[PDB]
Paper text:
At the glideosome core is the single-headed class XIV myosin A (PfMyoA), and short and oriented filaments of a divergent actin (PfAct1). By solving three structural states of the PfMyoA motor domain, corresponding to three states of the motor cycle, we show how the unique class XIV N-terminal heavy chain extension and its interactions with other structural elements define motor function.
Four molecules are present in the asymmetric unit of crystal type 1, one of the motor domain is in the Rigor-like state and three molecules adopt the Post-rigor (PR) state. Second, the interaction between the Relay and the SH1-helix is mainly hydrophobic both in the PPS state and in the Rigor-like state, with the exception of an electrostatic bond between the RelayQ494 and the fulcrum SH2-SH1S691 that is present in the two states. Third, the PfMyoA Rigor-like state is stabilized by atypical interactions of WedgeI587 with Switch-2F473, Switch-2V475, SH2-helixH688 and SH2-SH1S691 (red circle in Fig. 4b). Additional interactions with the N-term extension further stabilize the Rigor-like state, including a strong salt bridge-π interaction between the N-term.extensionGlu6, Switch-1Arg241 and Switch-2Phe476. The electrostatic bond between SEP19 and ConverterK764 stabilizes the Rigor-like conformation while it is unlikely to form in high ADP affinity states.
Numbering used by the authors: 3 to 718, 723 to 768
Write the structure that this text describes.
Amino acid sequence: VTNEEIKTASKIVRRVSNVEAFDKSGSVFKGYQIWTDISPTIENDPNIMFVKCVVQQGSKKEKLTVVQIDPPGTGTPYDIDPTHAWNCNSQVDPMSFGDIGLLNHTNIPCVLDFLKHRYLKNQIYTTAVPLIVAINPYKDLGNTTNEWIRRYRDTADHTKLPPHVFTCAREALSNLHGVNKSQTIIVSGESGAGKTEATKQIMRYFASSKSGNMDLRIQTAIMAANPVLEAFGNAKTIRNNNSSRFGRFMQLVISHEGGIRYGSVVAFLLEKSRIITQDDNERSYHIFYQFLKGANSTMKSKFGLKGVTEYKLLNPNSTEVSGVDDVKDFEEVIESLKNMELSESDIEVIFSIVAGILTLGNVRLIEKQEAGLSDAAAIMDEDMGVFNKACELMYLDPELIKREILIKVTVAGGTKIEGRWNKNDAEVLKSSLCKAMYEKLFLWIIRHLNSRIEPEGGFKTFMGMLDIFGFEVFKNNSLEQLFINITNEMLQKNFVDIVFERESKLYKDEGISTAELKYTSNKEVINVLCEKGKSVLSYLEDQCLAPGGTDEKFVSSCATNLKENNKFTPAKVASNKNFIIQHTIGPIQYCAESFLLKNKDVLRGDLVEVIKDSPNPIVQQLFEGQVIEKGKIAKGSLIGSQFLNQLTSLMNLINSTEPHFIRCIKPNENKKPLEWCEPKILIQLHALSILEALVLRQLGYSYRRTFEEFLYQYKFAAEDSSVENQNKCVNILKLSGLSESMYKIGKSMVFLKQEGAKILTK
């Protein structure tokens, strides 16, 4: 636990309702429990934020006398200001029901406890309508097996099943075949929160068919994609041994009995930087390690493969991951590529290109005295065999690749002015080639799979499945985080809209005015980030296309022009290269250092044309359909421009569907089962809008009983005397002296505000 985590969590903490510890006679109710912010136990443990106390008999109303009961205390009473006392759900078994909304008090210490109780008892799934909250147990609980799938698929009454990832899978599928409306399951959270697993389990649910009377050629290709996608797009980070370094979107056609008929995969924003360099105790993509360890002596000889520690692009110190068998994973990947309908030759080409990327990374560049220059780059003389092997393996012409990396042509005036690149600029070009070849090989493998698994006329009604990171808030947030946080702003509008849509329908069905239902939009912050001409992304594109473009000038243009909006804020410390966006979850600071370097990181020009001129059909296809444009930078070769189009395309699809949300929590930073870090978890409850989903549910007339249920709560039908029961309630609410704003009477139910429902019990 960092001190930044403690500072951040403390800002999330809020007290709303008032603690009612005293009886009508001013005496403390017998063993009345409260949560408190104050305790030595809290100060001494960074994992503890709140403590449970019993308010002592004879306590004063303005200063509470409490004895801390859990964590076990000294027994010594202490005085607290009632502003530091939150209500407690004493007498509630968190194991008996799966919805947080069912609790009487849903404050921060109450929500943390409900989920903690359940987590420690190995109940990791909890509902906070419309959300499914899943907490990483860091162990197999055996609750995602085939018998558990059958249990969730075949059970007649869905209300008899506890919360599970499978509840979204069952609900989404039921609504799809029920009303012929497309559905989307959005799986988000931090890295190591278990999004990967949630997606893998939902897909296995969907693959399980009641009657095996359907062709499974496509389904086997889709299911075989996960080991391949993981091998190429996932990597070991300090936070996760299998971190997904890309955003995944899938469209599926599922039979009502189960079984995947058709599918389409979309990968976006792969971490290109990782192919070239890795931090310490971090690896590059799994495939490099799987291939170098798992490939047979025949392929090892054919591709001239060295060991995992003999490559410049792979960290030598971090080549081993405990619990990860790269050799067995390689067997699984190869088998999966075969199940994706790729021939032994197609596979041999894929691994030739992989070995070629690794080989090219081992080619050393130096700075020679040539063409009247002292800084002309050149390939090291003993590495000329290595460079040729790299080109042979990638099915490229070494002479044309060499010319592209070393020679610099300025085509100004129609006139070709031929120069040379320096060792630094040529190392940039050699590195861009490894990154582009890898990304486009990964994208090709996906394009191949899609040609085999996609429906003929495209999708009409489909099951959408997005896997992305949630809101990212690090010390240093860069371009990558800005993209994830923009994506999350889009999905925030989807969340808010469906919550409102579902509530508004209910009120309309009962004949209650939705005029009081009032929830704000995030149109403003979306605009400050995306809006054509008037946005952060626009000024980024503008500064990338400007010849004298710098990170500082991009921040300055934003500061100047987006001064109009309250959503853009310059940073207090290092104003020149730092900014703040007022996201819905709060202010998120970004560091604009290397924004242009990262936004411009796309292989372009005559290098792309050398790849397209390859005699190999797979290599030809990698850059198939490219802007060409050697000289110089088009918005067709800028990352943010590409991203915003892809995002608009993605959102247009998601916006056409019914959304389902799975919010994944990482409970500790030590990959340990049954360990609970309250600050870490609080930040995530906030960021994943789990706390907002509770605030929203409880807004307006949230207390809804029927006419009869309201009459039973008063001790003294429906189909014989509904207008009698309707009027019996209207008289009760006039007699109790409640304000007309506190209640509304509908076709069959009584609509009470949360505060008005409380006044009725007292």
